[PDB]
Amino acid sequence: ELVMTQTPLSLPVSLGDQASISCRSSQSIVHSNGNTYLEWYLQKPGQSPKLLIYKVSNRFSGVPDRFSGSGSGTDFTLKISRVEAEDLGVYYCFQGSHVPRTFGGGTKLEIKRTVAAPSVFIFPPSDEQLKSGTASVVCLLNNFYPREAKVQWKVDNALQSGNSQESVTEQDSKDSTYSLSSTLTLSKADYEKHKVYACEVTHQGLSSPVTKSFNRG
Amino acid sequence: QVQLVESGGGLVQPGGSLRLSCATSGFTFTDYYMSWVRQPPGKALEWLGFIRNKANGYTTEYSASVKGRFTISRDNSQSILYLQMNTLRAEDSATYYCARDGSYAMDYWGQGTSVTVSSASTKGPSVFPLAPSSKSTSGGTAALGCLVKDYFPEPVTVSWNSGALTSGVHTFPAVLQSSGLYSLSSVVTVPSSSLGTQTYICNVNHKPSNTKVDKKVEP
């Protein structure tokens, strides 16, 4: 029955600013006898969800005071005054008055910081992996910002496509930057067939596209 | 003090069963309601159901999404929480958590146990080195890592030098190769001056295939 809808789904806040989030229920969540059990949980990258506010404004243990719960009946809001690197992750609201229990859609939170260009590295296929019969070339765009970043492979100045896939890490709780890995996959054969392997990275933080390459195969 | 450790996760054929367990310690197990909550990779949390404390006849409640197909129970003389699942489908694939509920809501959560529903069989990965490219181009700072390739199912653990190495360590999200086998890299950045006095080893561990590998990355 009950439907918990959070908003926004995403939220870009500047280190130090104030953040606000809403959780609207389908019906009053005032547990008949007593009060209203509306909680706020927060999940940080690679961790488990953790309690923040229980009843509605009730702040759990070691939780800073920057967090404050509020609202009643069908409108609740979680506010974080003076946001920072650590508060990164997804926030969720939970209704614990009516069964079945309900979980909010989930509001993500990314931290905006000054522009940082990616540092590029390029690794040729291991010898051990070549014995196998396949070669994996890996390009690394390390600690950059914003998230957007292009990567193109060129085997002998020839552009490539549909033979490589990427993977981006989640914003770092430290410097709030991203990292990306690209892997060019080719058969041991075709790899022997060429000479120059290059990785060309494009980013807002770069004034002129940077390139990393190597001559072997 | 309070400890909630779940297990029993792993790979399972579509249509089969798998019972999960959650070990607790550090509080009066029978005074609390015990909850089960799953989360598919990259998606939102989904309340599954709970079992009330003793004061309420240990009654169970389930989420419409799993009711009748899933069951919860508890061993009080041992303080263990259970979750029996049946006729599992591919979508049931997720990380399952347990938590206790009481005067402070779900104040304590477990670290989770991952589940995968697939007809595909287990497979240990192969680990190759992302060697500090010899002529490490214009840079006093070098990058090196390990390539964990061709494994199934997820997940795979990767630490450096038994955990001691933590600075500038990035483990990327696994991706699916056209072969239906996962793959992922783990990098670390350090000074190029020390590529002769230091040692770097990635300790990769799988589990669904009982695989442990400690590969020492070298220039």
Ligand SMILES: O=C(O)CCCCN(Cc1ccc([N+](=O)[O-])cc1)CP(=O)(O)O
């Ligand atoms: O009557 C009482 O004192 C118990 C409070 C009623 C709420 N109970 C237990 C209950 C559920 C959730 C919380 N919380 O903090 O989130 C606290 C207590 C729900 P149910 O009747 O078993 O579905």
